[PDB]
Amino acid sequence: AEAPSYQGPPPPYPKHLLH
Amino acid sequence: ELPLPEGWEEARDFDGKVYYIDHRNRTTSWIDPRDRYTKPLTFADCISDELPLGWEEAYDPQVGDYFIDHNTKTTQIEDPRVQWRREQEHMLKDYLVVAQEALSAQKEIYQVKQQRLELAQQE
């Protein structure tokens, strides 16, 4: 009778694209 | 069929769930960046089937269909479009009741004014 909890954020911005 | 804003990339989950990459701000979101311009902002602006910005339908094999609110990071089973509907129904019903009460109070005043006018005729 309860909905599944909120999944959370999507995958983080690609780390190999930062620097 | 509107294109993605520049700097944005569509992408998928390990599970296959779609999400969006903002290369300018270097961030990611569950929300299609075009939703801004195409979707209703409120339940009030919703037409037909529509869900407002940040809301999504989802299915769970144990509990069935439910709703995700990315705006408040919450989830619920009750249909938010239907709760809004009923709510507006309830507001109208109570408003017509207040209206009927105000109108009936004015009916009493006139009937009383009427009797007092007649009493002045007698005297």
Author numbering:
A (entry chain C): 546 to 564
B (entry chain A): 5 to 127
Paper excerpt:
WW domains organize molecular assemblies by binding to short, proline rich peptide motifs each with ~4–6 residues. To achieve this goal, we determined the high resolustion structures of 7 representative WW tandem/target complexes, and measured the binding constants of >100 WW domain tandems or isolated WW domains binding to known or previously unknown targets. In this study, we discovered that WW tandems, but not individual WW domains, can bind to target proteins with extremely high affinity and with very high sequence specificity.
We also found that the second canonical PY-motif of LATS1 (‘PPPY’) is preceded with an ‘APSY’-motif, and the two motifs are separated by only three residues with the sequence of ‘552QGP554’ (and these two motifs are defined as ‘PY23’). Interestingly, a Gly553Glu mutation of LATS1 was found in patients with renal cell carcinoma. We further found that the KIBRA WW tandem binds to LATS1 PY23 with a Kd of ~0.78 μM, but much more weakly to the canonical PY1 motif (Kd ~78 μM). We solved the high-resolution crystal structures of KIBRA WW tandems in complex with PTPN14 PY12, AMOT PY34 and LATS1 PY23. The weakened binding of the LATS1-G553E mutant to KIBRA WW12 is likely due to more rigid backbone conformation of Glu over the Glycine residue in the WT protein, such that the defined distance between the two PY-motif binding pockets of KIBRA WW12 can no longer accommodate the LATS1 PY23 mutant.
